[PDB]
């Protein structure tokens, strides 16, 4: 009857081989979601860089503006 254990364990192997194929599908899906986060991160960062670059520029000009006044008098 020991001829049966070789079949159940041989089937379990098959169920596990299937599960691998399913998880491999999830993995690819997961990758796609990762690429989206990566894309969204770089986008938000470029906006931040712009706004922040405009900010330090504003600081400069304001600094110069206040000079034409504090010296004008």
């Amino acid at each position: 009857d020991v001829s049966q254990k070789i079949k159940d364990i041989d089937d379990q192997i098959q169920q596990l081989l299937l599960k691998q194929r399913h998880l491999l599908s999830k993995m690819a899906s997961s990758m796609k979601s990762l690429k989206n986060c990566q894309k969204e991160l770089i986008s938000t960062q470029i906006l931040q860089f712009e706004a922040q670059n405009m900010d330090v520029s504003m600081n400069d000009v304001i600094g110069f503006f206040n000079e034409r006044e504090a010296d004008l008098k």
Binding site: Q14, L17, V56, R68
Partner: protein, 254 residues
């Protein structure tokens, strides 16, 4: 009206922020995805229950995600290329613009002077697909062939330099030998040549080229001058022998 300009050039203090802009590297993750893929065909081949079905389904599923992942990767590689170019173009365009000052600031606001706007240049990138080459990845050939060699480890596979090409293979007649032409014994460490598609067992050419710099290819002394470096490991041939050995093994105990 228009209190703030449409754009201003790259400020010296923003140099480091601009420099650090890049899309997050995924090379390491893609690598593991492919490795995970590989390890799956191995266990598949090595643990699939007795044939008479081939494995055409399993292979179809795996190749489906493999190509998906590969489609994703190409987009990622393309993404970096575009980011880098767009940035290089921005920096050069930004560097020709006058710095911001009491006079300059009004000009950038009014439009007299115009600086490049990275956010817009970013949104308006090429965006084509695939834009790359149908790389002949070693792991793609195994998938293409696998179903055919499973049901017949000797079936003569004809020329394939562009796998993934949904089309059936021109399976010739007869059958190839799972035995090294320089040992006349079944393989155990198949090696394929790069400049010619001849496969010899490792100890075959290992001793054939042993003591020599560049001897002509053993097979009918095939013109191709060869060396050990020209011999890669043959996954396809190893698959064949692997399968044959499993068939012989399954013929005795089933």
């Amino acid at each position: 009206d228009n209190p703030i300009p449409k754009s201003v050039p790259l400020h010296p203090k923003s140099g480091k922020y601009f420099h650090n802009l890049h899309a997050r590297d995924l090379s390491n993750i893609y690598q593991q995805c492919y490795k995970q893929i590989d390890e799956t065909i191995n266990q598949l081949v090595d643990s699939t229950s007795p044939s008479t079905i081939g494995i055409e389904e399993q292979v179809a599923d795996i190749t489906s995600t493999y190509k998906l992942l590969s489609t994703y990767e190409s987009e990622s590689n393309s993404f970096d290329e575009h980011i880098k170019d767009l940035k290089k173009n921005f920096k050069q365009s930004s560097d020709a613009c006058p710095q911001i000052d009491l006079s300059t600031w009004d000009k950038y606001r009014t439009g007299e002077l115009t600086a490049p706007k990275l956010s817009e240049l970013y949104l308006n990138m090429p965006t084509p697909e695939p834009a790359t080459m149908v790389n002949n990845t070693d792991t793609l050939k195994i998938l293409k062939v696998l179903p055919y060699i499973w049901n017949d480890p000797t079936c003569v596979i004809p020329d394939l330099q562009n796998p993934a090409d949904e089309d059936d293979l021109q399976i010739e007649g007869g059958k190839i030998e799972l035995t090294c032409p320089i040992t006349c014994k079944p393989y155990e460490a198949p090696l394929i040549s790069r400049k010619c598609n001849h496969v010899f067992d490792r100890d075959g050419i290992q001793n054939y080229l042993q003591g020599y710099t560049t001897r002509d290819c053993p097979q009918a002394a095939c013109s191709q001058v060869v060396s050990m470096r020209d011999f890669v490991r043959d996954p396809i041939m190893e698959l064949r022998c692997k399968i044959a050995k499993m068939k012989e093994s399954q013929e005795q105990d089933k």
